[PDB]
C-alpha cells in the first residue's frame, strides 16, 4: 500500500491504495476475493474487445 501510495505520489495511505495493494497481488486476491474494501472501487481493468481498433 505504501508502494501504491508512492506510485500515486502520496505519503498517506488511502482506502484506494489498500484496494490496489490487495487486488494487484495474486495471493492477497485469493485471500480477499469474497471481501469488499470500502472506498476502494475496482482495478482499472478495460477489456480488449471494447477498445476501438487502433490499428
Amino acid at each position: 500500500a505504501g508502494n501504491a501510495a508512492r506510485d500515486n505520489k502520496k505519503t498517506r495511505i488511502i482506502p484506494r491504495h489498500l484496494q490496489l495493494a490487495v487486488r494487484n497481488d495474486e495471493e492477497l486476491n485469493k485471500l480477499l476475493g469474497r471481501v469488499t474494501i470500502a472506498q476502494g472501487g475496482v482495478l482499472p481493468n478495460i477489456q480488449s474487445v471494447l477498445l476501438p481498433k487502433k490499428t
Binding site: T36, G41, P44, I46, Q47, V49
Partner: protein
C-alpha cells in the same frame, strides 16, 4: 461547427473516469429512502446510523460493480458489447443467487 464524438470514445472515457474514482455513485438520500422502504416491511419505526447506511451503500455499489463485471463478461462471451438482462440472469445463475 458543433463538435460531436463517436459513442465508443465517450463510453470508454467514462469507463476510465469511474474506474479511477472511488466516490459513491448512487446518491445518498434516495438510497437511504430505498433502505427505509425495504426495512419498513420488516419492522415499523426503524432507525439507522449514518455509517450503517454508508456501509449498505459501499457494499451495494461494490456488489453491483462486480455484477456488471460478470455481466460484461457474459456480453463479451456472447459476441456482444451491449449488456442484456440475459447476461445478468446468466451471471446470477452461475453465481448461485437465483433463489
Amino acid at each position: 461547427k458543433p463538435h460531436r464524438y463517436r459513442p465508443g470514445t465517450v463510453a470508454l472515457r467514462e469507463i476510465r473516469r469511474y474506474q479511477k474514482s472511488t466516490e459513491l455513485l448512487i446518491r445518498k438520500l434516495p438510497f437511504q429512502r430505498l433502505v427505509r422502504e425495504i426495512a419498513q416491511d420488516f419492522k415499523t419505526d426503524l432507525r439507522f446510523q449514518s455509517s450503517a447506511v454508508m456501509a449498505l451503500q459501499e457494499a451495494s455499489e461494490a456488489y453491483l460493480v462486480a455484477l456488471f463485471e460478470d455481466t460484461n463478461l457474459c456480453a463479451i462471451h456472447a459476441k456482444r458489447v451491449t449488456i442484456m438482462p440475459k447476461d445478468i440472469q446468466l451471471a446470477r445463475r452461475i453465481r448461485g443467487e437465483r433463489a
